[PDB]
RNA sequence: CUCAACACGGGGAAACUCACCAGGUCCAGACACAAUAAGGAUUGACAGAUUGAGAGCUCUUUCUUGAUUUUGUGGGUGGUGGUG
């Protein structure tokens, strides 16, 4: 066994929560202690451009947002089952990093 | 271009070796990242090839994209190499 | 006719062009000879005033480990034997320019079509 | 009678440009603290070589330059410099009380106003 | 902007055209057949006895170097 | 010619430029974006910058 | 140039930005044809003059380079040049 940590980061809520659900579902398929998904505060990345090219018109402003959702799950597992669970749950839009200790 | 002959050789061989060059639209860019020559030489050598045929260029986001055509792969053989060698990704 | 009548110097020189050993022109060759990387000299039938005659083989007939020379005829047709003049759209050649010293440093080359030239020099 | 910050004028000329900066203001001290590779030798070679032209008579030949951003040091005293205002070089004789000043302070870059009154 | 005045003196002047002299490669020739060095070679290890040092006035200057080889004599 | 591009470009608007059109006016370099104001507005959707509120 | 120009051009410009002014380099003029041209098409340069300038700019000088250049004819390319 070894202490591991899996960190998930995405811009899509629906594509991320089911991946963490698959992580925990594989976690109590063969039981081991969870320290389940601790959701970090969502990050809103704001870009406020004006509206236009050249400055003619009313001074209208836009704001654009990208939302970063982050989740980390702190597991412990035997060395064998680590690789398979880190490789099965791979989905577009979700970035998964695994810290060894 | 003056472009001394030992720098045509580096440029032309690498175009034969892979079949593609991208090379970074920036003149006076001081030693292009892949070939050991200047980046100005890479851009201007393959402009000479394109006007006569032999390569097709695409430009996007301050970058060029050079693709060796079938009339240029045969020509670049006797310039640098012997026959029965495959330049492009035609090698399986 | 049968095999060759002094026909072998071209394929000596064609394999010398492709491996950048042929120093066409005098000033590269005259400076090639003075530092000892010339293996064959083939200059001219005739020039004016014999100004460059004794200058070339004076560097070739020096008695230190090398006397290379053969001879050649008039240099206007040596331009085709050098790299000067392209195919020029199914013509004989391009507008060929002058000649009358070409010197090989290294051949990067092979058998009899080159080899029998050296027996013409190592033997008489 | 003339002294810069307590040292006499005849002490100024018999003193290297490094020792002058050690009593200069903070801008002059900062510039030559980070003044490596400023290329100062091309201009200054033409100043001493122009002092040999005039043995004892009137002011030497002008040495025209573009460097408006160059601090006057005591080795420049007595020379005459043509300072580029942007289109024209203006000869200005380097008076001893010009120390610590920039060459651009003595070559104006604009003809001022003359508002109206065509005369 | 309507035209150009060119207050500078009327200089469409160009470089020296890599000045075209006659044939010049001459060590010297004696009778039958030897040759000896004139305008002697360089002390550079990367100049392998093939370069001519110009002598302008009390200077020896190599052209294999971009700028400067000064073995003055 | 050793003076050709010799002026330093290490800060200020002359060094940086857009990565799409190579302009110097209206650049956005928040989060290392390096895209002009007008270029970013045409492809904010592709980057993932949508407009909610 | 009324609202619908005037802390607006994301325009808080010391250089750069830069489009303007006084000046100096470079071609980054592809390709095709014709000419020069291996008795050298051409390229670069120490020192001095000269230059704001350690710009071989250009000149004095005499080395280097070697067929890519040069010249001419057509074009090509670029333009924060014009016309919103």
From Swiss-Prot, chain B:
GO terms for biological process: cellular response to amino acid starvation; cytoplasmic translation; positive regulation of protein kinase activity; ribosomal subunit export from nucleus. Component of the ribosome, a large ribonucleoprotein complex responsible for the synthesis of proteins in the cell. The small ribosomal subunit (SSU) binds messenger RNAs (mRNAs) and translates the encoded message by selecting cognate aminoacyl-transfer RNA (tRNA) molecules. The large subunit (LSU) contains the ribosomal catalytic site termed the peptidyl transferase center (PTC), which catalyzes the formation of peptide bonds, thereby polymerizing the amino acids delivered by tRNAs into a polypeptide chain. Disulfide bonds: none annotated. Present with 54100 molecules/cell in log phase SD medium. One of its GO terms (molecular function) is structural constituent of ribosome. This is Small ribosomal subunit protein eS10A. The N-terminus is not modified. Keywords: Cytoplasm, Ribonucleoprotein, Ribosomal protein. Gene3D superfamilies: Winged helix-like DNA-binding domain superfamily/Winged helix DNA-binding domain. InterPro entries: Plectin_eS10_N (IPR005326), Ribosomal_eS10 (IPR037447), WH-like_DNA-bd_sf (IPR036388), WH_DNA-bd_sf (IPR036390). Pfam families: S10_plectin (PF03501). The gene is RPS10A. Belongs to the eukaryotic ribosomal protein eS10 family. It is found in: Cytoplasm. Component of the small ribosomal subunit (SSU). Mature yeast ribosomes consist of a small (40S) and a large (60S) subunit. The 40S small subunit contains 1 molecule of ribosomal RNA (18S rRNA) and 33 different proteins (encoded by 57 genes). The large 60S subunit contains 3 rRNA molecules (25S, 5.8S and 5S rRNA) and 46 different proteins (encoded by 81 genes). eS10 interacts with GCN1 (via middle region); this interaction is direct and promotes GCN2 kinase activity. GO terms for cellular component: cytosol; cytosolic small ribosomal subunit.
